[PDB]
Design a protein around this ligand. Structure first.
Ligand code: OMM
Lengths: 13, 230
């Protein structure tokens, strides 16, 4: 959403 | 008073994670090598800043307990510290000892990189304030982790959970300070004092990128998210 990319980097792995 | 075994494990673990960062020499060898235009420098800034965030996210996920925090609090900590962590790392690189007159040249290069005049003095005043404390690599590493795990950020819902993670880092840092500097019993406190001046760089971070002396300000989607630009 707002921090889509940041949320992705944190939720991957 | 000496680091406990738990504290020595914590410290070495923070050091390893901190060590996964771009070699300072890579950054300074390039800036010193030759003069670039404000345009080439703006591009170097955006690529360095995009890589810095990516590494910071990885460093942060490794901080003991960070993954147990509420997900929304995890984003709020990362978003709230990313720019401060960037300046702290820039301050570290700036105060690394270089051959004769190199830091003068590095300083002249950064001054004429394209950044606006209104941001030069505060920036060099901060980098200088940092260099005065003559920090070690363990101090830079711990201070970065303490900056990230700041429970007094905005949008943090569960502050006491963040406090619990930040406290062991403050305790290890305090002990290192009371060793690296027995003659400066104010070293721990000045390191914490710098963290306050660092928060001032948050106020105008978006404008620092926007007022760069280039015809156009193109940023990466990730940078747009972290800095507050479009
Ligand atoms: O990941 C990393 O390890 C990393 C390290 C350093 C930077 N920083 C940079 O590249 C920029 C350059 C970028 C190219 C132009 C010169 C400044 N930079 C800034 C600055 C100025 C202004 C703003 Cl807004 C942000 C930062 N201050 C610096 C002081 C220095 F000693 C230096 F060597 C580089 C410095 C970074 F992004 C990432």
């Amino acid at each position: 959403k707002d921090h889509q990319l940041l949320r992705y980097l944190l939720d991957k792995d | 008073m000496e680091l406990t075994p738990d504290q020595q494990t914590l410290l070495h673990f923070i050091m390893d994670s901190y060590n996964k960062q771009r070699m300072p020499q890579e950054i300074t060898n390039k800036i010193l090598k030759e003069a670039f235009s404000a345009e080439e420098n703006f591009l170097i800034l955006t690529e360095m800043a995009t890589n810095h965030v990516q590494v910071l996210v990885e460093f942060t996920k490794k901080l003991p307990g960070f993954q147990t925090l509420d997900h929304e609090d995890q984003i709020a900590l990362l978003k709230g510290s990313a720019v401060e962590a960037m300046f702290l790392r820039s301050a570290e690189i700036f105060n690394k000892k270089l051959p004769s007159g190199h830091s003068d040249l590095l300083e002249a290069r950064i001054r004429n990189s394209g950044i606006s005049d209104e941001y030069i003095t505060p920036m060099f005043s901060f980098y200088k304030s940092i260099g005065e404390l003559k920090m070690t690599q363990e101090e830079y590493a711990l201070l970065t982790a303490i900056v990230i795990l700041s429970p007094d950020r905005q949008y943090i819902k569960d502050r006491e959970a963040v406090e619990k993670l930040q406290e062991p880092l403050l305790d290890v840092l305090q002990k290192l300070c009371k060793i690296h500097q027995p003659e400066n019993p104010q070293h721990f406190a000045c390191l914490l004092g710098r963290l306050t001046e660092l928060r001032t760089f948050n106020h105008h971070h978006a404008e620092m990128l926007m007022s760069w002396r280039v015809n156009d300000h193109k940023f990466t989607p990730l940078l747009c998210e972290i800095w507050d630009v479009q």
